[PDB]
Amino acid sequence: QVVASNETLYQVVKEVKPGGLVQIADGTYKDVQLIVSNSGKSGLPITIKALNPGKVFFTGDAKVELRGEHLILEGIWFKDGNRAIQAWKSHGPGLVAIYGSYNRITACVFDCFDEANSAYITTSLTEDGKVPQHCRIDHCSFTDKITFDQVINLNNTARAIKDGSVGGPGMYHRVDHCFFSNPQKPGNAGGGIRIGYYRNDIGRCLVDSNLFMRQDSEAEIITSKSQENVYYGNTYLNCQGTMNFRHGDHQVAINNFYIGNDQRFGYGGMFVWGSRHVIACNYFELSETIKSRGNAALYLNPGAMASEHALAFDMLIANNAFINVNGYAIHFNPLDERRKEYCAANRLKFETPHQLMLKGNLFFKDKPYVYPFFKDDYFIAGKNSWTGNVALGVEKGIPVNISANRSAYKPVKIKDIQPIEGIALDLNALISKGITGKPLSWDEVRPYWLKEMPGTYALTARLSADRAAKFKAVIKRNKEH
Ligand SMILES: CC(=O)N[C@@H]1[C@@H](O[C@@H]2O[C@H](C(=O)O)C[C@H](O)[C@H]2O)[C@@H](OS(=O)(=O)O)[C@@H](CO)O[C@H]1O
């Protein structure tokens, strides 16, 4: 062990052996610089936790580095921060930076920490290039973030102009049972989670059972920038953005719920770039969609194949349900005007979504909304394949023959989908079952010791006077003088 000051904490962690347990006494640990270099062992991790979670706060000009392996950080509350604004950057290490593999951060609270730009948690490469793998971030709460960059960055490469066929190695991390709710920042200010950087990177990370409630940081709720990542059973409630397959082919999104249940803002949504994806059993019910992106539930990116804005084609869209979406259920050519100019400027060949396998999807609408189910300005007969879908409530918008018989609707059986190496999920079995369960609630994800939801944005879409002030200062110093 029990430590009650920063200095004794520093000492014990330098001495702790595998299987060790370091418990932090109730109190505030201000300007704490926790650097854990020792390592635990498989089956004998080193645990650093609050003796009484909820009573230990890491504050001030703080920082945590998990450099060894088999380490666990649990039950810590990060608040009242004061890191130097001229010392931290977006794309740099997070407040908590994980540099070693097999590490876990669980049941921790990050609430409007400070004004220094950075992610709250990151897996970062050491100076010699080694990439952290097999880490887990779970049951953590991330609220009222007023700084730039994502809440979480999972890195397997360093930032560089890029595009050398080379790509970062698979990471195999897992992000589950976390809560994300943060205020809207201007422009491409960093969203909820980023995984990887370019299409040649391999991710193989599992993001499941997370609750994003008014995760409004920016247009991207999650910007998945690496191959073979699996998003399963996540709930996105009233989020001003979309969950994206931004870079990297062969990504999976199964049984996620995208719900917009009021008229306060435009909600999303999934925006898809790239090919060979598996989008199945997702439930979309959006009371309002995003005007800037085209007003739809699912956006399929038009553009140049395998480019910076990779064309969306050759993928499986099965057993999804689009219920009373106030916008198009599927937009087949969003932002086509900009994309066509982008391709022209870069001497690329502009193309539009095709080779799409749409199977067993349900499209339904019975509310006074004005949008037909689909928008495809570049429709070509037979470019896509439609089987076992059901549509009724409004015009389809495109010349496609679809059953209107709801009573006969049934999800289809899929059995030719290969699982993702490193992720223990039977994709065929999950897809074939159809949509299971329902939206996740706070009690299903919150830290075991935390009863009430931190912050104010999730429930009020407003920040306190003190926090709104800091947020404005952050935004202002990052904009033209
Ligand atoms: C350089 C680049 O293409 N970045 C894209 C980003 O696009 C920029 O930002 C916007 C916008 O937020 O509306 C429009 C212009 O395309 C460009 O200045 C954006 O892509 S988008 O075109 O789909 O919007 C984001 C995803 O939201 O992805 C970045 O890579």
Side-chain angles (χ1 to χ4, degrees), residues 2-481:
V2 180
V3 295
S5 65
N6 298 333
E7 284 295 304
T8 57
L9 172 61
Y10 300 163
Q11 176 177 174
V12 179
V13 299
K14 294 168 176 169
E15 318 176 312
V16 66
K17 303 179 298 183
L21 174 57
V22 179
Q23 292 167 299
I24 302 177
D26 308 329
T28 294
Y29 299 72
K30 177 175 172 296
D31 308 317
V32 64
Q33 295 284 297
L34 181 59
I35 311 301
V36 186
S37 301
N38 298 335
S39 294
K41 294 185 175 179
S42 184
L44 295 171
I46 291 179
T47 300
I48 301 171
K49 66 183 298 298
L51 177 61
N52 298 298
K55 298 188 179 183
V56 171
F57 309 88
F58 280 7
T59 69
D61 187 359
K63 150 186 174 181
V64 181
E65 293 185 356
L66 298 184
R67 291 176 175 284
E69 306 192 329
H70 297 293
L71 306 172
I72 299 177
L73 182 61
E74 170 187 358
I76 303 302
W77 188 308
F78 298 77
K79 68 172 188 179
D80 306 326
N82 178 53
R83 290 176 296 170
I85 57 179
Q86 70 277 204
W88 297 75
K89 66 171 180 178
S90 296
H91 298 292
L95 173 53
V96 172
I98 303 179
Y99 298 83
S101 301
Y102 308 99
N103 296 319
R104 177 184 183 186
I105 312 247
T106 182
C108 290
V109 169
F110 299 75
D111 182 44
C112 191
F113 193 66
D114 64 11
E115 291 175 42
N117 297 311
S118 76
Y120 282 164
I121 300 178
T122 63
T123 51
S124 307
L125 288 63
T126 55
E127 301 194 66
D128 69 306
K130 315 197 310 76
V131 175
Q133 298 177 300
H134 303 293
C135 296
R136 181 184 182 189
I137 299 173
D138 64 284
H139 299 80
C140 289
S141 176
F142 306 108
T143 54
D144 296 3
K145 186 169 184 290
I146 61 172
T147 51
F148 292 80
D149 201 359
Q150 278 76 211
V151 171
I152 304 175
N153 290 315
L154 301 180
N155 301 294
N156 65 346
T157 65
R159 196 194 184 193
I161 301 302
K162 206 66 202 182
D163 67 65
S165 55
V166 295
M171 290 172 283
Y172 308 100
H173 304 309
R174 181 190 183 194
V175 180
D176 61 287
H177 301 281
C178 288
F179 182 66
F180 301 79
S181 179
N182 303 285
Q184 173 172 273
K185 292 172 295 182
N188 312 89
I193 307 179
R194 169 175 62 69
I195 302 183
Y197 271 132
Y198 319 86
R199 68 181 297 284
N200 293 311
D201 302 329
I202 305 306
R204 290 175 187 157
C205 291
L206 174 62
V207 178
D208 66 308
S209 302
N210 294 289
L211 174 60
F212 300 79
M213 184 176 178
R214 291 192 188 295
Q215 162 51 213
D216 305 341
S217 296
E218 60 135 283
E220 300 189 276
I221 297 176
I222 294 180
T223 184
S224 194
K225 295 182 175 182
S226 52
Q227 298 175 53
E228 302 180 358
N229 291 306
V230 183
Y231 300 81
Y232 173 71
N234 294 289
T235 290
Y236 306 80
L237 178 59
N238 303 319
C239 296
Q240 301 193 65
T242 55
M243 182 276 147
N244 309 335
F245 285 171
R246 184 66 188 80
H247 291 301
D249 301 324
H250 197 193
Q251 297 198 59
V252 183
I254 297 176
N255 211 295
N256 295 288
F257 294 79
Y258 302 87
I259 308 302
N261 68 189
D262 66 39
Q263 304 166 58
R264 204 177 191 74
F265 310 99
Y267 301 127
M270 285 186 59
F271 204 109
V272 182
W273 286 260
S275 62
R276 302 194 296 99
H277 306 303
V278 178
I279 302 174
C281 308
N282 296 293
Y283 181 103
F284 304 77
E285 185 176 358
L286 306 165
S287 58
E288 294 295 327
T289 51
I290 309 168
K291 157 58 191 183
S292 72
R293 296 302 182 287
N295 286 293
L298 175 59
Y299 305 77
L300 299 180
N301 188 69
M305 195 188 316
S307 64
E308 170 78 56
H309 280 290
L311 168 67
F313 74 111
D314 181 35
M315 72 187 65
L316 177 61
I317 301 178
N319 305 323
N320 296 287
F322 300 79
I323 308 303
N324 278 313
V325 174
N326 182 16
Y328 305 100
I330 304 177
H331 195 315
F332 295 79
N333 53 272
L335 306 179
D336 62 318
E337 159 175 34
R338 302 180 192 170
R339 294 285 186 271
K340 198 182 181 199
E341 185 55 53
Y342 175 74
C343 293
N346 294 299
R347 302 173 63 80
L348 302 175
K349 172 180 173 63
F350 177 75
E351 304 185 59
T352 46
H354 67 291
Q355 281 175 45
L356 304 175
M357 305 302 304
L358 302 92
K359 302 176 180 177
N361 297 289
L362 175 58
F363 307 85
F364 178 69
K365 175 268 200 181
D366 69 359
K367 296 190 176 183
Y369 296 155
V370 310
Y371 303 79
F373 287 134
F374 319 104
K375 178 178 176 63
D376 193 339
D377 297 313
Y378 308 72
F379 181 78
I380 290 182
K383 70 174 183 174
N384 300 310
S385 177
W386 301 72
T387 306
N389 301 287
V390 172
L392 73 169
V394 68
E395 63 173 68
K396 288 172 290 297
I398 55 179
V400 179
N401 189 192
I402 302 177
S403 174
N405 185 0
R406 176 71 181 69
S407 296
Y409 177 61
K410 300 161 192 170
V412 186
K413 269 64 179 182
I414 298 298
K415 308 181 177 184
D416 68 330
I417 301 298
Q418 291 301 314
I420 302 296
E421 180 279 309
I423 296 171
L425 291 181
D426 188 323
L427 308 183
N428 294 297
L430 299 179
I431 297 173
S432 298
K433 278 181 182 175
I435 302 177
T436 71
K438 63 171 183 172
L440 291 166
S441 62
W442 168 240
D443 291 310
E444 306 181 74
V445 303
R446 64 181 187 65
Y448 60 93
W449 53 273
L450 185 59
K451 296 181 172 178
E452 292 172 34
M453 182 181 290
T456 63
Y457 194 70
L459 300 174
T460 70
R462 265 185 170 177
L463 232 51
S464 67
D466 183 59
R467 294 187 175 186
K470 302 174 68 65
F471 192 39
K472 293 188 182 60
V474 171
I475 297 176
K476 185 171 180 178
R477 65 174 69 95
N478 189 279
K479 184 186 58 178
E480 289 190 52
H481 197 199

